[PDB]
Amino acid sequence: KSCPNPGAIANGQIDVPGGILFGATISFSCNTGYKLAGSTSSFCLISGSSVQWSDPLPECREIYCPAPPQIDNGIIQGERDHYGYRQSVTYACNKGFTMIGEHSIYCTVNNDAGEWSGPPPECR
Ligand code: NI
Asked: For residue 3, how far is its CA from the centre of ligand 1 (angstroms)?
C-alpha cells in the first residue's frame, strides 16, 4: 500500500506533493550547476506482488565549463582539471607586462551548459 522511502539524489531534490502511497507521484530536479540524467518523476505502482516506484531516481551531474583560455605573456594561477558553476580562474601577467581587462572570469551556466562569464584579460 506504500512505496519505500524515495532515498536521495546527490546534488538534486525530490519533491513529494502527496505522500508515497500506492498511486502517488514524486518529481525530481537538480541543484543549480547540475544536469539531470534519467527520470524526471516516479509513480508508486504495483508490479507482481511488489508495491514499488515505476522509475529509479535520476542522477545530477556537474555542469563543466570548457578549459579556460590561456593568454599571451600571462598565466593562470593554478588551473583546475574541471571548472564548475561559480568557480573562477584568475590571471596574472608576466614581468614587464601590464594587465588590461578582467582579472578573474567565472564559470556560469547558459542553458544547461558551462559558459565562461567573459573574455580573459590582455597583457601588454
Ligand atoms: Ni578542452
From this structure: 44
How was this model experimentally determined? X-ray
CA 29 to ligand 1 center in whole angstroms: 28
Residues 47 and 2 in one domain: yes
Neighbours of 119 (CB within 10 A): 11
The cell 537538480 sits on which residue? Answer: 30
Instruction: Say which CATH number the domain at 82 has.
Output: 2.10.70.10
Same domain, 73 and 26: no
Resolution of the structure in the document, Å: 2.0
Number of domains into which the chain is organized: 2
Gap from CA of 52 to ligand 1 centroid (Å): 42
**Long-range contacts of residues 65-70, Cβ cutoff 8 Å, at least 24 apart:** 65/107, 65/108, 65/114, 65/115, 65/116, 66/114, 66/116, 68/105, 68/116, 68/120, 69/116, 69/119, 69/120
